[PDB]
Write a protein that binds this ligand. Structure first.
Ligand SMILES: [Cl-]
Length: 466
């Protein structure tokens, strides 16, 4: 009925409910993205020890996180994949039913299908990164499917979106409407996701890593056919990047304060690392000054130092009396009854600087063109007014890893980059590492909440936490 007697407008509303569910899973009903991607194994300390989840995340004490916060948005909810599966199941429905909509525009029909496939793939990717093996279905009780299979099947679903649409008509490179720009899947969204999926396959299906890296290079070459749709904004216009809808964004989760589409405060990295614009005496947490002295060396130029951090960047104080904040994302606004957020912007899931660094990373790992890898890296270095890098081999691979840590701080990549590179168990790259043995038995995953077992009797838990 909804479909067979529907129309483009109702099909689009249904598609937008898929985006809504993904937003709920990541930002609006759970602080999933920032807990799982920024905070976990990060060298961070709470200003108030009563905020126990900060240390638990820092220390990978995920079992104590689940005992202290069993059901709520500081732990247990994040351990539930239910909201991502709402997105997945609605994508499955749209794909099964949309051909029934009488006489709608066929370009729009093809676009909505492409967007639904993208969002399904993005949801599966996000839950694989958090949970490991996950139940896999595309039919509108199943066991957990091998994460390598899930990732490979996602890649297979996404590839045709590029190959069948050589003109970027069904998914354009970018949208000119503010109602779509950054927040509806584009060709660039698809490319970035595929690069991430390949790089996860490098870690977890390593026997085929040469092919996955080659895939990322291929994807980079395609990204660079965007003909000026994407660009790196000036570093002094950083707030324009993080507001959302900029020419640097590749995929973003929409926030719209005026329309009551508001992320949880605790879900927004910015709101956890700011105080002066929020009428608070200190933020939720801060980064080690030693870490930031490593990350942003004091004797080398880098405009991110001045523009993204306050003057206490290197402070080793974790004192209430001497707080420090990160100002990278500031786009301050108020809503409801006087509630202030430091970041009214979209959450930037993938952006062009990140994708250029992934392209560089893959090239450097293949060892086939270190000069081009440097060129890519240096586009990001030059935008930050940091020194150009001219190196090769292991030094180049390290440079690109550390550059992603500098460039993407607070955007939900830190922990996940550590996992997919194996650096999460290496003290040379992570201040709060886990052990390699613990990694090998699944200590990089989140616990799976018992609610997942009610919903599906064929599900085994993540046993490191059991
Ligand atoms: Cl990225």
């Amino acid at each position: 009925d909804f479909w067979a007697q529907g129309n483009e407008t109702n099909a689009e509303a249904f598609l937008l409910s898929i985006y809504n569910s993904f937003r709920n899973a990541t930002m609006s009903q759970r602080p999933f993205l920032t807990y799982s991607g920024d905070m976990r194994c990060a060298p961070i300390t709470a200003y108030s020890t009563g905020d126990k989840y900060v240390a638990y995340l820092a220390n990978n004490d995920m079992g104590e996180l689940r005992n202290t916060y069993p059901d709520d948005a500081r732990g247990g909810l994040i351990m539930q994949w239910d909201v991502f599966y709402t997105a997945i199941q609605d994508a499955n429905i749209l794909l099964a039913e949309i051909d029934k909509v009488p006489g709608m525009d066929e370009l729009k029909r093809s676009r909505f299908k492409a967007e639904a496939i993208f969002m399904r793939s993005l949801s599966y990717f996000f839950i694989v990164r958090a949970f490991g093996d996950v139940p896999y279905y595309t039919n509108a009780p199943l066991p957990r499917t091998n994460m390598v299979i899930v990732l490979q099947n996602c890649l297979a679903d996404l590839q045709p979106l590029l190959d069948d649409d050589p003109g970027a008509e069904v998914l354009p490179w970018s949208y000119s409407s503010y109602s779509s720009k950054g927040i509806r899947a584009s060709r660039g969204s698809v490319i970035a996701l595929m690069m991430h999926i390949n790089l996860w396959l490098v870690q977890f299906d390593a026997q085929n890593k040469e092919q996955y890296y080659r895939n990322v290079v291929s994807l980079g070459e395609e990204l660079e056919r965007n003909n000026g749709a994407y660009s790196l904004l000036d570093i002094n216009r950083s707030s324009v990047i993080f507001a959302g809808g900029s020419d640097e964004g590749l995929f973003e989760i929409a926030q719209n304060i005026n329309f009551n589409e508001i992320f949880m405060m605790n879900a927004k990295f910015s709101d956890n690392v700011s105080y002066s614009c929020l009428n608070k005496s200190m933020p939720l947490f801060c980064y080690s000054g030693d870490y930031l002295m490593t990350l942003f060396p004091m004797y080398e130029d880098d405009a991110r130092k001045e523009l993204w951090f306050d003057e206490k960047i290197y402070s080793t104080s974790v004192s209430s009396s001497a707080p420090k904040e990160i100002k990278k994302f500031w786009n301050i606004d108020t809503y409801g009854n006087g509630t202030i957020t430091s970041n009214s912007g979209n959450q930037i899931v993938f952006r062009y600087a990140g994708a250029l660094l992934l392209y560089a990373e893959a090239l450097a790992a293949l060892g086939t063109n270190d000069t081009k890898a440097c060129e890519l890296l240096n586009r990001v270095r030059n935008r930050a007014h940091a020194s150009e890098i001219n190196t090769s081999g292991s030094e180049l691979m390290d440079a690109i890893f550390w550059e992603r840590c500098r460039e993407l701080i607070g955007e939900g990549h830190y922990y996940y980059d550590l996992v997919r590179t194996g650096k999460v168990y290496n003290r040379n790259y992570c201040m709060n590492p886990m052990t390699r043995t613990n990694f090998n038995v699944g200590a990089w995953t989140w616990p799976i909440h018992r609610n997942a077992l009610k919903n599906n009797t064929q599900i085994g838990l993540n046993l490191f936490w059991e």
